[PDB]
């Protein structure tokens, strides 16, 4: 799961991105689930820093 893939997937679900975990990127293999860290839930979505405001966790498939 590259930083590239995580960044591109965020733009894929930009409207859906939320405090809860996202669908797993992948249907065959391994990817990542992303969420907005509770501490940053009232931040605009264009102002979100990819490192310090996004919680990322791998998903096995």
């Amino acid at each position, epitope marked *: 799961p*590259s930083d*590239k893939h995580i*960044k*591109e997937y965020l*733009n*894929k679900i930009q409207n859906s991105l939320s405090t809860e975990w996202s669908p797993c990127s992948v249907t065959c293999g391994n990817g990542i689930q992303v969420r907005i860290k509770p501490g940053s839930a009232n931040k605009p*979505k*264009d*102002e979100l*820093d990819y490192a310090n405001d996004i919680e990322k966790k791998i998903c096995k498939m």
Partner: antibody
Amino acid sequence: EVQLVESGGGLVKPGGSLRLSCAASGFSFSEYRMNWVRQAPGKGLEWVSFISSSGTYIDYADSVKGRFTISRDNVNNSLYLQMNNLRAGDTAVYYCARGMGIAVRRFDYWGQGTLVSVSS
Amino acid sequence: SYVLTQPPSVSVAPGQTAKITCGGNNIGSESVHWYQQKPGQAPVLVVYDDAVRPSGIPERFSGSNSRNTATLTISRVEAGDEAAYYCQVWDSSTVASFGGGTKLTVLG
């Protein structure tokens, strides 16, 4: 159902100043990053400035740093660019572009542009 | 700021497929976008995030980004595709950055 119409282009003396406007309609202006992109005649596109949904985050290309100042009015859904101490290289067609993307960003919608011409 | 470098001109006959390259060392690690600017009009985003297309853009336009070369392929080229094409990157860690532009020419 989404449009961006720039205004304020004209002629100005070197060292003078101008202020461009971009009037946005058809999308909730207050929750989108806006940008200015200019293009000198016969040359390529050049990013100039960006302002975030609220105005907390602001950056400029080194080209225009210190002389230009971007601002937005989210009540009237308008974007502005105050350009001071203009030089010849500032001559170009200025576009206002809507920004999209979080970590890697793009310009999805563009206005037709306004021409700024700095000449003695 | 990431520097992108595109060929100045690119020619091809009608109905053939044209490839417009956007080069940079390890550009494959960056997410590239593409714009069409026909003479007098505003740019139009044809492809974002390397290969995804916005609504309305025909399937003829395709983007890939491998190693040191991003490529916007245009298949079954029509005369109307005659325009300028600019690749662009903007990772949130730096500022935006455009290529020099490639003038597509459909050969008559």
